[PDB]
Amino acid sequence: MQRIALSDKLELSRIVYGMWRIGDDADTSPAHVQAKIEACLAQGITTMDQADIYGGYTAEAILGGGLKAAPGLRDKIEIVTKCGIVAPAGRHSSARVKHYDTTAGHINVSVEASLRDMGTDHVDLLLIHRPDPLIDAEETGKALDALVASGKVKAVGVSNFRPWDFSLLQSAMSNRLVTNQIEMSLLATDTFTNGDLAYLQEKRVSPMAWSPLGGGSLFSGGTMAALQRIGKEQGVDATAVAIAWLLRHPAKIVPVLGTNNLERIRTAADALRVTMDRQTWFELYTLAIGKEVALEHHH
Amino acid sequence: MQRIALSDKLELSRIVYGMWRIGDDADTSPAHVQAKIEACLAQGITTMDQADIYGGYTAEAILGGGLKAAPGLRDKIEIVTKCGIVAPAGRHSSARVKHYDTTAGHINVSVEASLRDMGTDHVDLLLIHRPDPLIDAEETGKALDALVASGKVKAVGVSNFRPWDFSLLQSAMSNRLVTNQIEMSLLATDTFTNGDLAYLQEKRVSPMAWSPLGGGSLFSGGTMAALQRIGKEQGVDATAVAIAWLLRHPAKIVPVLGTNNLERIRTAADALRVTMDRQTWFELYTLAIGKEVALEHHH
Amino acid sequence: MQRIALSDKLELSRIVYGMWRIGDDADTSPAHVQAKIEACLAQGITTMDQADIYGGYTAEAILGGGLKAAPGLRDKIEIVTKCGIVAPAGRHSSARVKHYDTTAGHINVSVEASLRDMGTDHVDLLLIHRPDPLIDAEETGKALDALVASGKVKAVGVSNFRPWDFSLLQSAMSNRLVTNQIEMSLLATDTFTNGDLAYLQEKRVSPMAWSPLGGGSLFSGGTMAALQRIGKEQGVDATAVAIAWLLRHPAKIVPVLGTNNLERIRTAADALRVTMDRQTWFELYTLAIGKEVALEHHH
């Protein structure tokens, strides 16, 4: 599969496999985890997306069971992980309330646990998982810079940051943030006009798109009819067209697909087969927003 | 009429004549087009505002009929035109959907058609007509820079851009964008407090105000009574006061007036006769917003 | 009381005494004004917050009655004052409408009146009281710079500015704006996520928080029960906990407390006795917003 360079130091697969449901599968054995990773690799999807909090702080260890039992498998993938969200589950069950923690001490503890749980000495990309209204940017930026200098983390980014959050944390760091993982799909189009995507495009930062299929709501009329029509014109399913709509954007959006289904992994690359011309991009955008683009103001 | 320098390379009349309705007139003859331009020139209004899309891609050619039959008339005016909006009309009737196109190829084709249609070798100002959610800023900025270097376009700006759109496109260009054509009037006051006008004021960019009379809704109670009162105090009509309210702002707003009526052209300059002191500016602003300005927070 | 350096030139008390109600007290005698200032000084609160408009342009003169009758008292305090709001009261009663005035002439007249009314040759901090939709930033910034160079004003800031207002005025000034006085409390939490506080945090500018108790609405269920519980755990009242919630933020927020009650002045410093850990900060923030913080987007 085509590669995307987020920076001179980090290259992903153009589509990323989200592992947030890996702990929900009835099968969490090393063998089934390896099978899922091997199905991705068969399609050239090498990038796995994790977070400390997934599975109530167990999804990384479940991935680790796979990796620790298959020597050589970690060298074939990039691992994205995240920290900053503290819910009273698993190892954080002492917690009195759901909160964010962007402190140097917490980031280091979470990274040490990610490395322990997945059986590796480095993660390819670490994201601050949510913007913290209590962030000390100086402290957080120093911790993130030291994690890169150490080699434990190849690159750093953020998730769900607004442009002003991104700007504040980048002002406190020597290393450049290489991504912002944000909701983007035909059902979530605000970032295209509200400044979120423009900011990233001006900074030459690729976003990672979460819920790129619209979070299950798109498949459950006019939008779906057009996705199915284009798919049938190009020999792919409506799912591939909804991902290709993201891939078409010149901001170089990196979709994160989160299925436990080996047959949807088998077809995930079909999005790269879609030719999405400018007019088709607008047809889908207009059906999704439910109204025509603004025409001449003088009318 | 008083001149306004948008830059060292482009100077307009302080009021601009919008030609978006020129094709709606029952009379589209060269003679009637010349009459309208000559009525503007009689009031010192030298700047004409066009767009490729006006008249379903025919308004420029209708202006051209006037200019081509009156040698010397083009040298007396500045021409603003715009591109980026593609509706299925006239030469774009093959189009499947209403969309934006900011590609180098489309901008060049639209500019070549503007020059052909108006019978000139240059336009004074070219605007991207709407912010394109699919913009490639690098590509668009290269096309706009080459159009300036070529002499085909004296200066470039945008229309309906948010500050983040303006910032993204300017980051990709060597030439400075000299304006943003946005809605501003007593019925459209959001830009005064929402950051749109502050951004332009910090960049020392004059906006062009579209629908400066409120788009026909202002004339169709308290606001109109005050405009009529001030006009009767200063020997002008309520229309001149509504334009002078824009002219008073220190951001150096350039109103675009869009009438086919020779008698409203004859009086358009009366706005420059209005003395609009700070208190009068606030009286009108407060009547328009329908509530007092925020006073001391401690109360 | 702990000091806060807004800059190399200006240091306040970490809590500020707002004098906006000083004219509402039945007692406005010099003796009662001195008593209030002496109650603050007894708690290490040295910073007094004024504005030209307070008391309909009489509150400064009422403070002055106190200061002029107590030689040496002005040297013990810092004075913050503000201008820019013109209401038809007192010396501005000729005014036809409520408006803003950020002109050099008005700022100078207001500062000269603040110095005359309080009987001093300098103010520690001058704020533009409200963002003016008619601001000429070049003119206002020149007036503010000259006021600092003159020694009449030790430092300048703003009040109720949005980030774009702050950015515009700072672009026109040589001196750095040292604060933005904005609404911040458990009932006013928008600035924590909407970019207002992030902007100030990136610029290393401390905000001053007005209505830090929520403007009387907080004391008049779940939020109050938690403030009372934490206070009873730490030997202080719920008021001290609501102020400590602001003091905990790493942006170094400076609360402005506006009581005429000598017994609430006597206890105002109790906020500095509160230990507010990250989880407690989130518990209060969550009770105030009325919903959990956003958890993992993948769920």
Q: How far apart are CA B155 and CA B177, in angstroms?
A: 7
Residue contacts between A and C (CB atoms, under 8 Å): 80
Q: How far apart are CA C239 and CA C263, in angstroms?
A: 12
How many CB atoms are located within 10 Å of the residue A262 CB?
14
A130 annotated to bind ligand = yes
User: What sign has the CA pseudo-torsion B256, B257, B262, B267?
Assistant: negative
Q: How far apart are CA B33 and CA B147, in angstroms?
A: 28
| Facing residue for B298 by CB, picked from C54, C98, C133 | C54
Q: How buried is residue C112: exposed, middle or buried, by Cβ count under 10 Å (0-12/13-18/19+)?
A: exposed
The H helix count followed by the E strand count for chain C is: 11, 12
Q: How far apart are CA A58 and CA A25, in angstroms?
A: 13
Q: How far apart are CA A110 and CA A131, in angstroms?
A: 17
- Asked if B202 is an interface residue toward chain C (Cβ–Cβ < 8 A), one would say yes
Nearest CA in chain A to C191: A133
Closest to A193 (Cα-Cα) out of C192, B163, B178, B156:
B163
Q: Which residue has the tokens 């901008």?
A: B107
- Asked if C195 is an interface residue toward chain A (Cβ–Cβ < 8 A), one would say yes
Q: Residue A294 and residue B160: Cβ atoms within 8 Å?
A: yes
Helix H segments across chain A?
30-42, 54-57, 59-68, 104-118, 137-150, 163-171, 196-203, 222-234, 238-247, 262-267, 278-289
**Beta-bridge partners for A155:** A125
Q: How far apart are CA A103 and CA A143, in angstroms?
A: 8
Backbone angles phi, psi at A74, to 5 degrees: -65, -35
B108 annotated to bind ligand = no
B71: its two tokens: 């040698």
Q: How far apart are CA B228 and CA B212, in angstroms?
A: 16
Residues written for chain C: 299
Q: Residue B87 and residue A285: Cβ atoms within 8 Å?
A: no
Nearest CA in chain B to C168: B202
Q: How buried is residue B241: exposed, middle or buried, by Cβ count under 10 Å (0-12/13-18/19+)?
A: buried
Amino acid, single-letter form, for residue B27? D
A268: its two tokens: 């995930």
Q: Residue B195 and residue C162: Cβ atoms within 8 Å?
A: yes
Report the phi/psi class of residue C252: left, alpha or beta, with left for phi > 0 and alpha for psi in -120 to 50. Answer: left
What are the angstrom distances between the C-alpha of A188 and each of A180, A195, A242, C129, C277? 15, 14, 12, 39, 36
- Asked if A196 is an interface residue toward chain C (Cβ–Cβ < 8 A), one would say no
Nearest CA in chain A to B19: A298
Kindly give, in sequence order, each residue whose CB lies less than 8 Å from that of residue A63, ignoring residues fewer than 6 positions away.
A19, A22, A33, A48, A50, A117, A118
What are the angstrom distances between the C-alpha of C69 and each of B96, C26, C262? 82, 19, 20
Closest to B159 (Cα-Cα) out of B13, B20, B65:
B20
User: What sign has the CA pseudo-torsion C100, C105, C108, C111?
Assistant: negative
Query: Which residues of chain A lie closer than 8 angstroms to B136, CB-CB?
Result: 250
| Facing residue for C98 by CB, picked from B199, B249, B293 | B293
Q: Residue A40 in 3-state DSSP?
A: helix
Backbone angles phi, psi at C292, to 5 degrees: -60, 155
A258 annotated to bind ligand = yes
Closest to B110 (Cα-Cα) out of B53, B63, B170:
B53
Q: What experiment produced this structure?
A: X-ray
Under DSSP, the state recorded for A294 is P
A212: its two tokens: 């790129």
Nearest CA in chain B to C136: B250
Q: Residue B87 in 3-state DSSP?
A: coil
Contact at 8 Å (CB) between C52 and C63? Answer: no
Query: Which residues of chain B lie closer than 8 angstroms to C135, CB-CB?
Result: 201, 250
Give residue numbers after which chain C breaks (C–N above 2.5 Å).
220
Q: B: neighbours with 3+ CB pairs under 8 Å?
A: A, C
Report the phi/psi class of residue C122: left, alpha or beta, with left for phi > 0 and alpha for psi in -120 to 50. Answer: beta
Distance from CA of A277 to the nearest CA of C (A): 30
Under DSSP, the state recorded for C186 is T
Nearest CA in chain C to B251: C136
Contact at 8 Å (CB) between B36 and B262? Answer: yes
Catalytic residue numbers of A read 54
- Asked if B162 is an interface residue toward chain C (Cβ–Cβ < 8 A), one would say no
Q: C: neighbours with 3+ CB pairs under 8 Å?
A: A, B
Q: Residue C228 in 3-state DSSP?
A: helix
Amino acid, single-letter form, for residue B236? V
Q: Residue B183 and residue A279: Cβ atoms within 8 Å?
A: no
> Using N-to-C axis directions, what is the helix angle for C104-118 and C59-68, rounded to 10°?
40
| Facing residue for B295 by CB, picked from C18, C85, C164 | C85
Q: How far apart are CA A7 and CA C275, in angstroms?
A: 42
Kindly give, in sequence order, each residue whose CB lies less than 8 Å from that of residue A89, ignoring residues fewer than 6 positions away.
A53, A56, A57
A254: its two tokens: 């990196």
Query: Which residues of chain C lie closer than 8 angstroms to A258, CB-CB?
Result: 298
Contact at 8 Å (CB) between A192 and A214? Answer: no
| Facing residue for B51 by CB, picked from A199, A201, A296 | A296
Q: Residue A140 in 3-state DSSP?
A: helix
- Asked if C297 is an interface residue toward chain A (Cβ–Cβ < 8 A), one would say yes
B215 annotated to bind ligand = yes
Contact at 8 Å (CB) between B82 and B51? Answer: yes
Q: Residue C137 and residue B282: Cβ atoms within 8 Å?
A: no
Closest to A251 (Cα-Cα) out of A190, A175, A169, A196:
A196
Catalogue the E-assigned strands of chain C. Answer: 3-5, 11-13, 16-18, 47-49, 78-83, 85-86, 99-100, 123-128, 153-159, 179-183, 206-210, 254-257
* Residue C110 parent element (H or E): helix C104-118
C145 annotated to bind ligand = no
Under DSSP, the state recorded for B88 is S
Q: Residue A298 and residue B210: Cβ atoms within 8 Å?
A: yes
Contact at 8 Å (CB) between B52 and B81? Answer: yes
B159 annotated to bind ligand = yes
Distance from CA of B194 to the nearest CA of C (A): 8
Could you write out the three-class secondary structure of B27-66?
A: CCCHHHHHHHHHHHHHCCCCEEECCCCHHHHCHHHHHHHH
> Using N-to-C axis directions, what is the helix angle for A137-150 and A104-118, rounded to 10°?
30
Q: How far apart are CA C201 and CA C207, in angstroms?
A: 9
A69 CA to centre of own chain: 26
- Mutate one of C60, C134, C158, C181 to test the B interface: name it (highest B CB count within 10 A): C134
B180 annotated to bind ligand = no
Contact at 8 Å (CB) between C129 and C123? Answer: no
Q: How far apart are CA B197 and CA B190, in angstroms?
A: 9
Query: Which residues of chain A lie closer than 8 angstroms to C282, CB-CB?
Result: 97-100, 134
| Contacting A residues, span 165-184, partner chain B, CB-CB under 8 Å | none
Residue contacts between B and C (CB atoms, under 8 Å): 80
For strands C3-5 and C206-210, give the pairing: unpaired
Query: Which residues of chain A lie closer than 8 angstroms to C283, CB-CB?
Result: 96-97
Give residue numbers after which chain B breaks (C–N above 2.5 Å).
220
Q: Tell me which residue range forms the domain holding A96.
A: 1-299
* Residue B208 parent element (H or E): strand B206-210
Q: Residue A98 and residue C286: Cβ atoms within 8 Å?
A: yes
C183: its two tokens: 């609404």
Return the C-alpha torsion angle C43, C49, C54, C58, nearest 10.
70
Closest to A287 (Cα-Cα) out of A185, A148, A175:
A185
How many CB atoms are located within 10 Å of the residue B142 CB?
15
Distance from CA of B293 to the nearest CA of C (A): 7
Resolution in A: 1.8
Q: How far apart are CA A15 and CA C42, in angstroms?
A: 64
Catalytic residue numbers of B read 54
Q: How far apart are CA A111 and CA A241, in angstroms?
A: 36
What are the angstrom distances between the C-alpha of C136 and each of B196, B248, C140, C179? 16, 11, 6, 20
Query: Which residues of chain B lie closer than 8 angstroms to A248, CB-CB?
Result: 134
Q: How buried is residue C26: exposed, middle or buried, by Cβ count under 10 Å (0-12/13-18/19+)?
A: exposed
Q: A: neighbours with 3+ CB pairs under 8 Å?
A: B, C
C159 annotated to bind ligand = yes
**Beta-bridge partners for C188:** C185
Greatest CA separation for chain B: 67
What are the angstrom distances between the C-alpha of C283 and each of A84, A220, B31, B219? 16, 37, 75, 53
A260 annotated to bind ligand = yes
* Residue B234 parent element (H or E): helix B222-234
Q: Residue A297 and residue B99: Cβ atoms within 8 Å?
A: no
| Facing residue for C134 by CB, picked from B199, B250, B283 | B250
Q: Which residue has the tokens 């507010």?
A: C276
Could you write out the three-class secondary structure of C72-93?
A: CCHHHCEEEEEECEECCCHHHC
DSSP labels for B115-173?
A: HHHHT-S-EEEEEE-S--TT--HHHHHHHHHHHHHHTSEEEEEEES--HHHHHHHHHT-
Q: How buried is residue C105: exposed, middle or buried, by Cβ count under 10 Å (0-12/13-18/19+)?
A: exposed
| Contacting C residues, span 211-270, partner chain A, CB-CB under 8 Å | 248-250
* Cα C297-C298-C299 angle, rounded to 5 deg: 100
A264: its two tokens: 């949807």
C254: its two tokens: 């400076």
A181: its two tokens: 């993982």
Count of structural domains within chain C: 1
